[PDB]
Design a protein around this ligand. Structure first.
Ligand SMILES: C[C@@H]1C[C@H](C)CN(Cc2nc(N)nc(N(C)C)n2)C1
Length: 330
């Protein structure tokens, strides 16, 4: 089996991407944020505290003939940005792009934090990191990908995110028409539950490539590229007027600037992030200070290859017995 679904930016900045997902019988279609940095599939639901729902589409398990309470199971998750959600759990049929899993754990939110309430376009998350991070207690649950894996033609999924445009998540096959050149594969550590890998270095604009190992995670659920302070300082030093602002919470730059590209290494291959991808626009409406798309990871405890990086590539998440990650230009 295979699946193929279009993923669409939620706003003009590509803050996140939503992918339609069919849950239950008859289908209830919710737009979920596919997140390779977490491992819970959770949804706004008929159980979500009413004051915490503001425009989202909800899953109503009582209207699904295939829903069953996973008795006694609860979940609670916190994300890197300080947001959180929690609730109880149903099993139900879940389909993505024509690929169906029966008995998928669908985590029904009873509570969500304000950032979730405020984002009317995101109806929940679909985690695609390793199932060892799943928060369901007392019986940990598997991700959609892990459940689907045995049925897939090949034990892989791919992320092809667009820059200010739709893109694609495929399950079970590699679309050889979706990238240019060859795919370079690199080793993954699953020790922290993430798609964790080591980049071989970087370049700023037309500058020379610096060979240096940068350990980080491929995280479709993080907007920006978070790298060591040394690397980030070297990038922003090439932009006149750029500075780190403690009041704003990161590097900002004059909106009149033209940003240089940023290259990261994957083995002996190179992925180039165009300068435009690093522009997140005014910090507030009408401001001439713009927020940068490359920020320091200092204090996070891990480097994060978020959407800014991933959208510059066709990315293969290879869930074979020994997982690997592949990157191609596109
Ligand atoms: C780190 C956060 C902190 C809050 C207070 C302001 N924002 C400004 C801002 N402006 C813009 N344009 N884009 C972003 N992000 C993509 C995160 N954020 C940065």
């Amino acid at each position: 089996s295979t699946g193929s679904a279009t993923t669409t930016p939620i706003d003009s900045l590509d803050d996140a991407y939503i992918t339609p997902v069919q849950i239950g019988t008859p289908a209830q279609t919710l737009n979920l944020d596919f997140d390779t940095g977490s491992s819970d599939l959770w949804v706004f639901s008929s159980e979500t505290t009413a004051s915490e729902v503001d425009g989202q589409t909800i899953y109503t398990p009582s209207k699904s003939t295939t829903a069953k309470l996973l008795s006694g199971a609860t979940w609670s998750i916190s994300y890197g940005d300080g947001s959180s959600s929690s609730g109880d759990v149903y099993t139900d049929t879940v389909s993505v792009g024509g690929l169906t899993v029966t008995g998928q754990a669908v985590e029904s939110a009873k509570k969500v934090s304000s950032s979730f309430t405020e984002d009317s376009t995101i109806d929940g998350l679909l985690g695609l990191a390793f199932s060892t991070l799943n928060t369901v207690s007392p019986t940990q649950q598997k991700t959609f990908f892990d459940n689907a894996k045995a049925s897939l033609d090949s034990p892989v999924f791919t992320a092809d995110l667009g820059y200010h445009a739709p893109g694609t998540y495929n399950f079970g096959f590699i679309d050889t028409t979706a990238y240019t050149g060859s795919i370079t594969y690199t080793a993954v550590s699953t020790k922290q539950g993430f798609w964790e890998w080591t980049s071989t270095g970087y370049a700023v604009g037309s500058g020379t490539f610096k060979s240096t190992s940068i350990d980080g995670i491929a995280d479709t659920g993080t907007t920006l590229l978070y790298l060591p302070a040394t690397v980030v300082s070297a990038y922003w030093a090439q932009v006149s007027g750029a500075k780190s602002s403690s009041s704003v919470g990161g590097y900002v730059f004059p909106c009149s600037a033209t940003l240089p590209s940023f290259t990261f290494g994957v083995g002996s291959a190179r992925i180039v992030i165009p300068g435009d991808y690093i522009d997140f626009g005014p910090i507030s409406t009408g401001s001439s200070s713009c927020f940068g798309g490359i920020q320091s990871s200092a204090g996070i405890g891990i480097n994060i290859f978020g959407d800014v990086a991933l959208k510059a590539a066709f990315v293969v998440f290879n869930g074979a017995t020994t997982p690997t990650l592949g990157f191609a230009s596109k």
